[PDB]
Chain A
């Protein structure tokens, strides 16, 4: 159960990094589209 806990934590960490990257990218697209206006 300890090993399964650390494995779940690792997959959650990879997903969290990918989510923060795509989130910031979408925010930058929205900033550019609003600045062009």
Chain B
């Protein structure tokens, strides 16, 4: 049972949800910025 307390999770599941939502928003905004500069040419 101690060896199955080892795994790798320690935060409350609310904190896991907060981390997952924040990281989802991060990947969204970074992909949106990179797509903006994919589409935008400052020159003609």
| Interface residues, chain A, with chain B CB atoms under 8 Å away | 18, 21-22, 25, 29, 32, 36
B29 on the A face (CB < 8 A): yes
Instruction: Give chain A's interface secondary structure class.
Output: helix
Interface size class of B (residues with CB under 8 A): under 10
Collect the chain B residues with CB atoms within 8 Å of residue A22's CB. 42
Contact with A along B1-44 (1 / 0, CB 8 A): 00000000000000000000000001001100100010010110
Output the nearest chain A residue to B42 by Cβ-Cβ distance. Answer: A21
Which 4 A-B residue pairings sit nearest by Cβ, starting from the closest? Answer: A21-B42, A22-B42, A32-B33, A18-B43
Query: In the bound complex, how far is the Cα of B30 from the Cα of A25, in angstroms?
Result: 15
